């Protein structure tokens, strides 16, 4: 067992790739674009191209963070939910996924139901808060 770099475990199965989540997660907002950049210096050809990159790097981070918040998974690397798996998105068993598939292959397999799955997860977290207000 050895530590990997960024995306170094893209070709390994899920069972082995899931042990390197913090390698990819640690690089989502931080980069060299936020340096001091060594005729308005912020209107030059590459003054604008740098500014757009800074805003793009922030939207990409917040796009994923928006979903984590709605599902109640803020501040977690691996978050468990209360949504049962539906055997129409995929009916593969344990070994056929975590020992035979890569994260790229799988995410392409359920790519038709990612939008549906996202909506269900948000709706589930909403019920937990509803069921808690009228329980305490």
């Amino acid at each position, epitope marked *: 067992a050895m530590i990997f770099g960024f995306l170094g475990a893209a070709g390994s199965t899920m*069972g*082995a790739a899931s042990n390197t989540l913090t390698v990819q997660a640690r690089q989502l907002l931080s980069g060299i674009v936020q340096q001091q950049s060594n005729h308005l210096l912020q209107l030059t050809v590459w003054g604008i191209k740098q500014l757009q990159a800074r805003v793009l790097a922030v939207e990409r981070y917040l796009e994923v963070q928006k979903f984590l918040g709605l599902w109640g998974c803020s501040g977690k690397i691996i978050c468990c939910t209360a949504v049962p798996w539906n055997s129409t998105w995929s009916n593969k*068993s344990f*070994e*056929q996924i975590w*020992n*035979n598939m890569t994260w790229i292959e799988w995410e392409r397999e359920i790519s038709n139901y990612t939008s549906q799955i996202y909506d269900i997860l948000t709706e589930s977290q909403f019920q937990q808060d509803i069921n808690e207000v009228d329980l305490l």
Partner: antibody, heavy 119, light 106 residues
């Protein structure tokens, strides 16, 4: 996809050395491990060794520990097996079996037609 | 070095009965067991793996179960294609030993 084909039968005199090659094609060779079993005539299969075509790591059986060695070739995607000091009881059909999955297979997906060797 | 012992040697059978094949173990094996169907002149074909799961293309009438040391292979509606012998293999110890094998008479 994927299919394992072995060589033809061999009639080797006792005491000689026999090499049998199992050629794998039409699938990623390095992803799945390869196992060898021998079905003694009128008997059940026996497990001999397991070879990883990715890093070459091999596993052998004690009785065959000092007699059997497994080697794998990547560029032409072929698996080789050599056995030396052929006792008279080594006559059996030899199979090459692909692992079920890429990790902790617990099963064999595809086999070869077999190579019956007489000694 | 776990030895697999399975009985009975032979099963007198015809169409439509509950034929059961039992594979015992000499040590704790767990759910790591597989069943192979061998037809004459053909290499063994995997039918059940993990002692519960069914391989691709096998009819649903097949089934397996048990854990620890005792395992079974039951065919509810035996049909004229389930001929040949069967083997059980263990997949946790340094050698992956097979079983003596049982033949079904049809």
């Amino acid at each position: 996809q994927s299919y394992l084909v072995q060589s033809g039968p061999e009639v080797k005199k006792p005491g000689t050395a026999v090499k049998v090659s199992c050629q794998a094609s039409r699938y990623p060779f390095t992803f799945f491990g390869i196992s060898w079993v021998r079905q003694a005539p009128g008997k059940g299969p026996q497990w001999m060794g397991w070879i990883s075509p990715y890093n070459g790591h091999a596993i052998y059986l004690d009785e065959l520990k000092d007699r059997l060695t497994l080697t794998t070739d990547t560029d032409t995607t072929t698996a080789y097996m050599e056995l030396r000091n052929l006792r008279s009881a080594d006559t059996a059909v030899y199979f090459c079996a692909r692992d079920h999955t890429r990790q902790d297979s617990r099963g064999y997906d595809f086999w070869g037609q077999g190579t019956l060797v007489t000694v | 070095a776990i030895y697999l012992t399975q009985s009975p040697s032979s099963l007198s059978a015809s169409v439509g009965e509950r034929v059961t094949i039992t594979c015992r173990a000499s040590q704790d094996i767990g759910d790591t067991l597989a069943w192979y169907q061998q037809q004459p002149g053909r290499p063994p074909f995997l039918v059940v793996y993990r002692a519960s799961t069914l391989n691709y293309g096998v009819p649903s009438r097949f089934s397996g179960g048990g854990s620890g040391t005792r395992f079974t292979l039951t065919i509810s509606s035996l049909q004229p294609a389930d001929s040949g012998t069967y083997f059980c293999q263990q997949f946790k110890t340094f050698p992956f030993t097979f079983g003596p094998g049982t033949k079904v008479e049809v």
